[PDB]
Each structure stands twice: as structure tokens, then as C-alpha cells.
Amino acid sequence: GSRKCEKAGCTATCPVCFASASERCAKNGYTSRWYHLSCGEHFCNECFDHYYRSHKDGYDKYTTWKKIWTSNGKTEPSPKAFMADQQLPYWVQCTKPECRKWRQLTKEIQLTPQIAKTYRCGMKSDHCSLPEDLRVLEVSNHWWYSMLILPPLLKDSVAAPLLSAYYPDCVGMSPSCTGMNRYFQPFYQPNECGKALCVRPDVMELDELYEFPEYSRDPTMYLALRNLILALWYTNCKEALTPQKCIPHIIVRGLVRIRCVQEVERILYFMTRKGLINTGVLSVGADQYLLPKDYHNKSVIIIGAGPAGLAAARQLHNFGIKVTVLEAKDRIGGRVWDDKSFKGVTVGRGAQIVNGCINNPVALMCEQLGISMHKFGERCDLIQEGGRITDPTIDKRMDFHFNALLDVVSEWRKDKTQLQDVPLGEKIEEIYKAFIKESGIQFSELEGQVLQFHLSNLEYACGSNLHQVSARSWDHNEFFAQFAGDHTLLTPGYSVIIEKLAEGLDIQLKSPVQCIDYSGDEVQVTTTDGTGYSAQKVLVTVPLALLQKGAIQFNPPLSEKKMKAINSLGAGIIEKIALQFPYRFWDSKVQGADFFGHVPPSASKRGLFAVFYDMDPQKKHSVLMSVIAGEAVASVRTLDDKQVLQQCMATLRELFKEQEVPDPTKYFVTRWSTDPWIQMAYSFVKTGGSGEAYDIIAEDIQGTVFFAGEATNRHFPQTVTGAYLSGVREASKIAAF
């Protein structure tokens, strides 16, 4: 026999058998062949044969395992795999602060999270004083992993139950193993259509390969640790996820467990910086910062305290980075602004709906806050002035035609460039006329009016009359995976999330920024009253309209490229009206539906209260909300609030013609259009424009000036979610520096 190892380049000058399974085990002596698992782990040819040979006592145990590993995995069941999976002793790190030595557990002991959580040397003299096995240090040599035969496979991963559709060994888990918020679906399932904020359990994302190139050859270990980390975060999103919390949940045999534990911290911090975990409204204070002291030296001025500014500020602050927020208005929130004065209900003057809760940051934050959302039902009757609910067949007939018009638009645009763009509204019109011409079919006036409702609904979505919006690019964002699942009413209002994000941050109100100078060593920021601020980096999150107006003086000036992109998007607008009543007059006719539609008498009036929203899902209080979109936004600019209220009440008395309607006892009418520091509702792509505009606006300048806000998120434009995510995005970029 020999004392040398098979593996070329192995530094084991004295192989010893860890298995001792054969009554003939060679121990530290001679054997025909030493089989190598790592630089510190070998088993002799006798113990090899003990399992591998049919006439040996350990053959049963190896064939049974070989069967489970077949009905469960995609990797070949080799004896070395069996060894690493079944016989290799566990290692656990002493938890005594001043020791922290790694210890080998005896071969019969099965390591559990509870054992790892509290382990100290000797747990069955000063056991902590016994020297650490010399093999432990070796593990932190980069070549150590390179001479590992097989990649680690985790046991009982917290991620396991979420991945029952994959081969465990394809996602870093062991084939021989084995009440979450329904909105948490972090992992793509096999054969799934795209959905927002999902990762593949079996493939590294582009940014991941960028940060951890050493895993491009074999991503097994990374995926297992990343998947575990996400599972742990979503299992409990109310606490910072730390390495200490993860380590006990890393269960794998062998010295490799030490390498896994050493990697988890790197991956944790990357996940945190990028905003995948330890995020949302989670708050962390002095001596709880989520990123190492290495990121802390730096400073930032954030301009704007809406969802985007507050997202970035929350992230950076939690990171340990010095942040100051400058807000123009006497309040935070921006286009989030809730009226809490209504009886028993919260009514948003701005945002209040969550579009697609699955994996939505907003859904996470509701979880963290213990907030419940109301899922909208599907029903939305199209009610005519005055009284008549639209015939179901007429309803279906015109829905079909409306969407058929969209199909042909999407067909027309396929070969058109930005230089040939035409307005969506004009395109739809032409296609419609040319269809009635082609086919002698003729629609009634009502059928035409129902079509107008649908058109109005497009205008609400874009915040613009359709003759302004791009036929080519109106729905550009759907090129990317969107947020799936329920649309909900955020009944408590977005303001609760806003408050929570801002709590304890350094925020200066009534401080409108007028000048940003990034020509010197650090950014000089000056307010409209001449007050000076300075920091290493600046993030601007002001609304698109304000960038278009040029209310902030940039030195040096924004690029011509940026200006073209800024002007190629539209500062979309809608206004809201809310009305309180003495009683729920609509219950008889509406029958519990979350909303009801209003068939337009004419094309010109189509955006005047097209949809009415019942603002109490408990059906107890009497508040209606409605919207003003498209052409009707203009028609209302010279009308005072009372006049708008009069037209809304006139509309309601028409919609409910065959009954009486009580007077409203309290109401508001929004004027976002003329709020000086906002001047809009949400962005859209103007004719001639491209989705790429969102990317261009998003582009930092010289890693010194950064941009966020709903109009900088190409994937998720318009929304609080999108604005929030753009802030997380920029916080990651800023923290990397």
C-alpha cells in the first residue's frame, strides 16, 4: 500500500481515513489507494470497497442511498458523492466569542441548527484551549476549493419547500433529504411566464456573475447560499438577516461547511446592497448598520422625499451611509398624499392602488407593518346616463372590438421607427373607420359610446389624451416581466409606508433645490433661499415635469442626450375627486362591486368620471372616488372645486336616474396639475418616444449625480412601486462606490 494521495497537487502529507467503516480500515497507515474528497479529507481503499463491493457489509447502505439519489436527483451516485453526503463528519464553530475555533464532531453526531446555534468546544479542562485542527486554516486558501472533488449540497434548506419542482442537486441541495405570505414568490417555477422580481434558483443573474466570477464554472455553492438567504428573508422579513442567523441553517458534511460559512457573509452583503433582502420598511440603527464599515465613509444629498427619495434614503441610511434629504414642500410623500379626515376611511389624493402584489415591494412592506390590503373583484358594470346597465352582449361585443383594434396597432408598429411614430389615438381611429368601411357592419350610438369608455380607460392609464401617446411605445414596459397577481386597494393608504420609510431620517422640508454644481471636488447644492449644502454625491428624484421645466440649474448642464429623453416622455396627469355621503345610496344597483363604469355621452366628455370607486371594502361607510382623465383634465382647469363637484353630482344623478341621490357632506378635488413642485400624476411615452428614454434619464453622471423616480424606471414606470425600486436601484449604485 501507499501513504500518498491519488489527487495531483494535494498537499495532504499524511492522509487518514475519516470513514472507518470497514473492519479493515487502514486508518493512518498503508492502503492500496487513498481516495480524495478534499485536501483534508480522504478514505482508504478498504472503506471504499466496504460500500462499493457487493460482498461487503456496507453495500446495502450504498445501494439504498443510490436508489433515493435516483428517484430524486440528476447527479450520478458515486461512492465519493455517497461519502460527502452520508459519512463525512460534520464541523461546527465554537460560539464562545473569544474562541471561535472550528471543531470536528464525532462520526455518529448529526449536526442540527440548534446544535450549531449554541455550540461550544467540548459539548458532548479548557476545551477551548486545545489547538484548532490545522486543516481548518487550509480551507481559506483559494486553491482549497479548486481541489474539492464535488460541490457542497445543503441539507434541509429553508428554500427546499419552495423548490420541490427542481432536482435538489441542480439548486445546491441534497437529493437524499425530506405559512408564507402568498405574495412572496422569489423563485421562478419551471415553465413559468415571466414575472417581476423573480430569480432562477438554478442560474446566476448577470449582476451575480459580475460580482462573483469565480462561480461561473460551478455556481452550485453560490445558488444554495443565495437561495437559502432569500428563503430566510421571506420567512421573516421583520428582522435584519445576519450571518449569525444564516449559519445555523447551513447544514452540510465536511470541511466544506467551513467554506460555505465563510461565503455566506459575502453573499449576504451583496444581496443587501442590491436591495433583495434587509429592505422595505425595516429600520436599523447605530451599531446595526447592514453593510460593513467599509461602505460608510461617503455622503449623499437626496433631492425629493417621495417614494423614490425615501427609498434611497432608507436604504443608504440602513447601510450606514450619511444621508440628507431636501424636500421642496412642507410635507413628505410627493404624489403620495392621504386624506385621513373622512369618517372611518383613508382616501388617497394621490396613489392608493397596488398593481400586482406578487413579489411587489409594497406587499412586502405591508407584511412588515401587519397591514392588510383589499383585493379588487373583477366586476365593473358599464352604466349609462341615465340608469341603464349595459347589455352583457353589447359589453362583450365592444370589448372584443376595442382589443382587436389594439391587436392591429401592435401589428402596424412592428416595422415602424421612432421617426415614423403616430399617436395611438389617431391610429385606433383610422383603423376603426377603415374597418367600418371594409366590413359594412355599423355600430349603434351606444356601441360607439361603450368603445369610448374603453378609450377613456387607456387615457386614465397613460395620464393623457390618446392623441399625445405613442402608438409604438405606449405599452413599452411590458417587454419586461411585470408584477403578477392581485391588484389591491391599499386601504390604510400609502402614507403609512411613507411615514415609516422617513422615520428618523435627516429630512429638510421647505427646502426647494435650485442649483446643483458638480464641477468641483464635491457637489454644491443651493436652495431657492440661498442655503448651501454639500456632499460627495447627489441623487435627484424630482418629477419628470420639473426636469422638463428646468427648475434645477445643473452645472455642468445635463447632456443634450438626456434632455431629448426627458422631453420625449410626457408628464401625464389625472385628478381625483372624493365624495362623502350620508348613506350608501348605490348598494341596490351596484351590489357590492368595488367599482362601476360610466358610459360617455360623447367622445369629448369620456374622461369625466369614467370609473367610480367604492372606498370602503367593508361596505359600511359611504365614500366614492372618481377620476378625471384625458380631455376632461383640461376642461376642468378653470373650474373651481365646487363646480367640479357639481358636475360629478350631476353625473351620479344621471347614473342613478331612477332613484334619489343624497347630497355629499364632504369632498375634495385634487389639483396636482398646478402643484408647483409636482405638476403631474405619472409619466408616459409621447409620440416619437422610446422606452429607452427611461434608461437614459436613469443614467448617473460621472458616478456623482444620480437619478431616480417613476420616470426613471423603464421596467416599472408610473407607480409607487416603480419609484420605490428606482430608489433602491440608485442606493445600490451609490453604495458600491
Binding site: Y166, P201, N403, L458, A461
Partner: peptide, 26 residues
């Protein structure tokens, strides 16, 4: 954008649906 719609969502004009076909799948 279409994604802003809750009540009475439009459906026409959508690009074909893509479906992840990974090998890691049992």
C-alpha cells in the same frame, strides 16, 4: 402604460407569451 389599469383592463396588442424551459426541472 397598460399596467396602470385595474378596472376593466385592456388585453389586446400583447406580445406572445414566453415560457421558461429550464433543465433543472424534475
Amino acid at each position: 402604460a397598460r399596467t396602470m389599469q385595474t378596472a376593466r383592463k385592456s388585453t389586446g396588442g400583447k406580445a406572445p407569451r414566453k415560457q421558461l424551459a429550464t433543465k433543472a426541472a424534475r
